[PDB]
Amino acid sequence: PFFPPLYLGGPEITTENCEREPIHIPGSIQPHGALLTADGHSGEVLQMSLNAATFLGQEPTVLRGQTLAALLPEQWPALQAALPPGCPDALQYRATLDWPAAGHLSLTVHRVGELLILEFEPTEHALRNAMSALESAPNLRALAEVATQTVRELTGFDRVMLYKFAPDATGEVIAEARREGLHAFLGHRFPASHIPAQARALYTRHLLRLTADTRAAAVPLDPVLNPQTNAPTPLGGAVLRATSPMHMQFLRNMGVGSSLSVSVVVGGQLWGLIACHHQTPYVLPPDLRTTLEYLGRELSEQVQVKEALE
Ligand SMILES: *C/C=C1/C(=C/c2[nH]c(/C=C3[NH+]=C(/C=C4\NC(=O)C(C=C)=C4C)C(C)=C\3CCC(=O)O)c(CCC(=O)O)c2C)NC(=O)[C@H]1C
């Protein structure tokens, strides 16, 4: 059972309790975007990342308590209609905003219970071709190789691996596409503890996560608890959520500045990950993550199909 989070007096995580870190409720985000939470009926802004006012060019005193009706007059009606009470928390509303201070922004919203969680991130044929290349791959090894190469072409990531889970939850790199000069991980195996049980569980439900800068400090939400509930804000579905410090350290020690993975789910089980690295920090574009999500779904389908062919 999970430890309390750090802001509720929980311990700093160590290697004796990796599996007890409540990674879904860090009460903080990555600094390359901003996060607001809002009441699902009134649109009152209930929580904001500490960088939100600066990120959005708003006056801090105005921002909290403000309504989405006032902050987002052009999206609020659409947002309400798209995300009514009781909808799947996987359901998304997305809009592109031309924000004077911030530039071109992507807004992604989902509902958890009575709370709307709004993520603002800068934004900046290929999909169909990629989907068809996966389809047309003749066997599982070729499928793995095509998936890693295609994802690398689309993203420009220094390394893209297909990381397959064994029944004991150890992991193996079974294909990779890599920048010239990077050492090979192909065929290397890693302990189950490096992607602990609660992470593997989360990754069965929320299929993409990333760390854009492995040296960046997390930006707290304020207030840290959802005022509706006096309880933690569920961020398992927020790509902006802070990454486990233990994992961030693991990445820095690998010389990885940016990391992103996409779940491969076969028969409702976590089969593996498309796992990506960059040496420098790197914010992968939002619509481009959408493409990666589609490719993850296609790969998951094709792994099942290819495993059936044998
Ligand atoms: C004591 C806890 C530990 C720990 C925790 C931890 N690890 C993750 C997430 C990931 N770990 C990954 C592992 C690898 N990436 C690689 O490139 C290789 C090897 C070539 C390995 C073994 C991966 C891929 C992830 C997924 C996230 C990503 O793609 O960057 C988490 C969950 C992080 C989060 O979602 O907040 C946690 C808590 N890792 C350890 O090594 C020990 C110290």
Side-chain angles (χ1 to χ4, degrees):
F2 52 85
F3 280 155
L6 297 168
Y7 54 83
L8 293 185
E12 291 177 43
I13 305 299
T14 63
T15 46
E16 288 177 344
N17 47 56
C18 304
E19 77 283 3
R20 307 191 66 178
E21 186 178 356
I23 59 173
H24 63 293
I25 49 162
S28 61
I29 67 158
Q30 301 178 52
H32 65 276
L35 193 147
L36 304 180
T37 75
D39 187 87
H41 160 69
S42 74
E44 175 194 341
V45 174
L46 294 178
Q47 306 168 275
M48 63 183 187
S49 54
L50 301 188
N51 70 332
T54 295
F55 188 97
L56 300 176
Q58 286 278 308
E59 168 61 45
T61 56
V62 183
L63 192 45
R64 202 179 303 126
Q66 193 174 217
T67 64
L68 293 180
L71 186 66
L72 306 176
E74 303 220 84
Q75 290 80 34
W76 173 236
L79 193 164
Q80 290 174 98
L83 300 178
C87 63
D89 78 65
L91 190 55
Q92 284 195 349
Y93 167 83
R94 181 163 276 168
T96 297
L97 309 174
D98 205 347
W99 209 269
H104 313 275
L105 296 182
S106 166
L107 170 60
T108 303
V109 193
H110 65 287
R111 175 187 286 272
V112 184
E114 318 187 1
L115 195 71
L116 297 171
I117 296 170
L118 294 82
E119 297 173 274
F120 298 82
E121 313 169 61
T123 187
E124 301 196 322
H125 61 289
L127 177 60
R128 187 191 40 66
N129 298 307
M131 298 283 279
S132 295
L134 292 179
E135 262 191 286
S136 297
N139 53 61
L140 195 277
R141 175 170 164 177
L143 176 57
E145 286 172 355
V146 167
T148 57
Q149 187 49 53
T150 301
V151 171
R152 182 156 189 258
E153 297 169 344
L154 287 166
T155 62
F157 271 119
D158 289 334
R159 185 192 300 272
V160 178
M161 299 163 282
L162 189 56
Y163 188 94
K164 181 188 190 317
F165 292 105
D168 63 7
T170 60
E172 188 166 357
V173 174
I174 65 170
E176 62 180 352
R178 65 196 183 288
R179 183 166 172 170
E180 308 277 65
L182 288 189
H183 64 268
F185 283 128
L186 184 60
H188 297 215
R189 297 183 63 206
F190 304 89
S193 71
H194 294 198
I195 314 183
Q198 86 283 34
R200 299 193 301 268
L202 182 67
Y203 296 167
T204 307
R205 303 185 291 264
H206 299 286
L207 312 177
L208 187 152
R209 77 302 309 181
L210 63 88
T211 304
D213 181 352
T214 55
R215 289 191 176 268
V219 174
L221 297 191
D222 185 41
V224 73
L225 301 179
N226 179 5
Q228 297 176 325
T229 56
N230 196 44
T233 301
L235 294 175
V239 178
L240 289 182
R241 78 163 168 83
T243 301
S244 165
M246 299 290 269
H247 183 52
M248 290 182 73
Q249 177 173 72
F250 171 87
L251 294 172
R252 295 189 294 270
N253 273 350
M254 283 189 73
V256 172
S258 182
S259 187
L260 181 149
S261 62
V262 181
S263 297
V264 186
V265 182
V266 181
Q269 293 191 251
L270 191 60
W271 183 98
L273 302 171
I274 303 167
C276 310
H277 297 161
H278 217 57
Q279 293 164 275
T280 80
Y282 187 43
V283 178
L284 193 70
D287 294 320
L288 205 141
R289 291 206 301 272
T290 313
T291 294
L292 256 48
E293 291 170 52
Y294 290 102
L295 292 178
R297 280 200 288 283
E298 185 59 27
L299 177 60
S300 300
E301 289 163 17
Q302 290 303 311
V303 167
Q304 191 147 44
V305 168
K306 270 51 180 65
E307 286 185 342
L309 301 172
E310 205 68 45

